[PDB]
Symmetry: C4
Amino acid sequence: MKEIKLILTDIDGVWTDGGMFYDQTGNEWKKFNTSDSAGIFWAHNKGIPVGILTGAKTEIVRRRAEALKVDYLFQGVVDKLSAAEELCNELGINLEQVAYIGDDLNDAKLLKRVGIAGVPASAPFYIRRLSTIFLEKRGGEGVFREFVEKVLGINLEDFIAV
Amino acid sequence: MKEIKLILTDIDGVWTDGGMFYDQTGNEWKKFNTSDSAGIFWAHNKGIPVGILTGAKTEIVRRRAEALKVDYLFQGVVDKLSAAEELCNELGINLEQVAYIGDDLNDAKLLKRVGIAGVPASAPFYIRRLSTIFLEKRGGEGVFREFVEKVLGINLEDFIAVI
Amino acid sequence: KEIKLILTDIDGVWTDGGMFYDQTGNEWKKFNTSDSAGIFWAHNKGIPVGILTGAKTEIVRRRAEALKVDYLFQGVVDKLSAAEELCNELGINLEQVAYIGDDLNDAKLLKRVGIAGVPASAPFYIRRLSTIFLEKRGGEGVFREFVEKVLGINLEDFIAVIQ
Amino acid sequence: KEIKLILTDIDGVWTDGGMFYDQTGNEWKKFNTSDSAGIFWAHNKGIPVGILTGAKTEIVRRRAEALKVDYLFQGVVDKLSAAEELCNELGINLEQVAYIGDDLNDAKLLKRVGIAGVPASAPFYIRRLSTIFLEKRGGEGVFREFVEKVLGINLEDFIAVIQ
Ligand SMILES: [Mg+2]
Ligand SMILES: [Mg+2]
Ligand SMILES: [Mg+2]
Ligand SMILES: [Mg+2]
């Protein structure tokens, strides 16, 4: 199991089922899973920072990232690979030391280049097949939590200890 | 796949799971799936315009349509076949060259007329049986994206080409 | 058997039991658009539909209006009495009523109607009261399913309304 | 095992763990109407119900009020000590308590109560802490399932209440 010094994640399709609610005025909702917050916990327990890369720019994600003590947030990302480089360079780590989870076309380049790639079970096939680990969960089912636990090797003794 | 020059689509039951959210104050919601934006991508990638027909008329659909850069939007449509037939005429295209995806009663006449008919796995049986291709996904699960990829025969080459 | 009136519960039938609350006193319910056909099948035959619910919301008032439901009763704790009172006013007995419900406040009425329906999602003790098999769960079009079975809605009936 | 108090977590038990955030980040939760019957069975058997939660929302307060929950502790930093604190005030032991929760911060309490439940949706490490089998996931009416098993609710009990 590789050495991971950064954990990065997409939001829609990973922390959610891809759901995007719109009301008659064009306001938007998203639905996260409380199970995913434990992903942050295990990460921080092992001394690893967590970053979010998203193409959108919403208070929804800013707040949720704030709720969960996420270390790095990049919104309005036009090129997720560029986003991860920048952050890696700033952290002084290489892409090989990154575990990233994404679910769609704009996640492909970065997924083909990270140390560990995860893709939820809900995702398109040609993205799915880029996953270097088996994830059973679908987007919004707690797959970010599943991703982190597997990447970090969280066992029973890990659970007991906390 | 037969040759398609226009992809048409219903909303409720296709882009959503049929869900209609009502609150106490007169507001309404729909739940879309980001997954389906890639159906628009692929269509435009293959030079194919996308049109939306819906019986209802909500700002909910108008805004979503603009976000996804949909080419044609027709709301308040009571006769969807009549709507499809007029848009075909303006485009100078035939109905056999149209791919339509729908899920309910008011979609049935048009489904029987297009070149490729798609119906989500969640649709009532009397409509599902009209699909001329097999669709595994349910409404709101990315069935629109699945419809577009199949109808256009999007493959791994098309994927390697964009990344 | 000959049905003259369709009655129905809301939460757990027209929805999956989901009750969305925010922080300000507002609420959601998520209905399914394919259920609106259930009303259509009923009205196409000249049969009214009524709603019996123990909650009282502007949500259901709005949805019932949009759907042109004939009878709406809210804040009902005694559904069996409320149904009989309507039946008396209609000149029918309960043996001519089809009722679909999902919980304890529905138990008495289900044991007494001509045809009782209970969604696949329902608690076992209520599910066993159903006199017809229903495959769908709350919020998945189980009301439409119920209406179609109760009214013997066949492929033949389907071709007719899409003429 | 005789139970004098039932305690429950919210998110992941009364919900599928979904945390809805609106455009400005305000929260909604989806409850299931089926779970209220868990309150009803508790009170039928003369057992008070308590809610423990780390979050503090008006969402939970309104629902608790609506369901006539006996005890409500919010902003709880350690669920076990809050539970200890209430049991001390009521003069009961954790052994006389049944608790259902679903994540890490429930683990310590789950190991202390007389009957522990954990929903089928929960993380493996927490699920194994459950002392009775629960088939339902969070949001599916698993609080109700939990109470009916704990209290040994039989068809006899059901028949008794619908007379
Ligand atoms: Mg995504
Ligand atoms: Mg539709
Ligand atoms: Mg109900
Ligand atoms: Mg919880």
